[PDB]
Design a protein around this ligand. Structure first.
Ligand code: 0Z3
Ligand code: CA
Length: 240
């Protein structure tokens, strides 16, 4: 998160860190959203490498014991059947991970509330992106969870010439684009939380930014529109 602020410890409890095994250690690669005590929603591109992965719920400071973390292994990865590694602009950048154990819910670990199927947010809707990714373009991971106020840019505006054009599809949410605040590498998979009827709901899964830089005027951060995937999500959790 470029142009972010430090999140309070309990503000966003459905946020997880997706980490992979590096030598004796574990490194953060992506965010996610806890959606069931044993299921995480993240972006499909986050698990395209065949790495050993773990999820950390209740995490705040990556590099420090918070006294609130639960570590759980990933048991099963279901990516969207239509996801293509070579074409992120096609969409379908969503995956579901079955955890090896059910996590315990407390004020640090909560399930994220999903939107009703088909819900589109009006332009300039109040949303927040959270994550541990790069705080500058080509910078470094944050060690505490950051948040940034990122209002949505609706599809007409976002798919216009000036903006993402043809690269954005109606299965995506655009948010931000002011050249100051943005999602950046390592925030992929994470939540875009939007305040709806007095309730925060997870409307985006972070998917991409520009090839030119994270915080670029008129190139909003792009998210998988979660409400486009509610029947697939339910259908996976029911069977698996
Ligand atoms: C400055 C220049 C090197 C530059 C190049 C690319 C970007 N970023 C990008 O275009 C964004 C990174 C990103 C994702 C989500 C949120 C924020 C940022 N990258 C993506 O869309 C890829 C998805 C690859 C799909 C194929 N397997 N994301 C990533 O792999 C991740 F996790 F590291 F962030 C930003 C800057
Ligand atoms: Ca920690």
């Amino acid at each position: 998160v470029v142009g972010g602020t430090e999140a309070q410890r309990n503000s966003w409890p459905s946020q997880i860190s997706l980490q992979y095994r590096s030598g004796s250690s574990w490194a953060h690669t992506c965010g996610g959203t806890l959606i069931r005590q044993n299921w995480v929603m993240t972006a499909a591109h986050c698990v395209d490498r065949e790495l050993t992965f773990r999820v950390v719920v209740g995490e705040h400071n990556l590099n420090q014991n918070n006294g609130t973390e639960q570590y759980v292994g990933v048991q099963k990865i279901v990516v969207h059947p239509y996801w293509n590694t070579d074409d992120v602009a096609a969409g379908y950048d969503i995956a579901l991970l079955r955890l090896a154990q059910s996590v315990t819910l407390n004020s640090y670990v909560q399930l994220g509330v999903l939107p009703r199927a088909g819900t589109i947010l009006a332009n300039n809707s109040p949303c927040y992106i959270t994550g541990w990714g790069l705080t500058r373009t080509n910078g470094q991971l944050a060690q505490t969870l950051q948040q940034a106020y990122l209002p949505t840019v609706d599809y007409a505006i976002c798919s216009s010439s000036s903006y993402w054009g043809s690269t954005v599809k109606n299965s995506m949410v655009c948010a931000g684009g002011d050249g100051v605040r943005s999602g950046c590498q390592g925030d992929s998979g994470g939540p875009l939380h939007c305040l709806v009827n007095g309730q925060y709901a997870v409307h985006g899964v972070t998917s991409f930014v520009s090839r030119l830089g994270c915080n670029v005027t008129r190139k909003p951060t792009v998210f998988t529109r979660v409400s486009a995937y509610i029947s697939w999500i339910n259908n996976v959790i029911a069977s698996n």
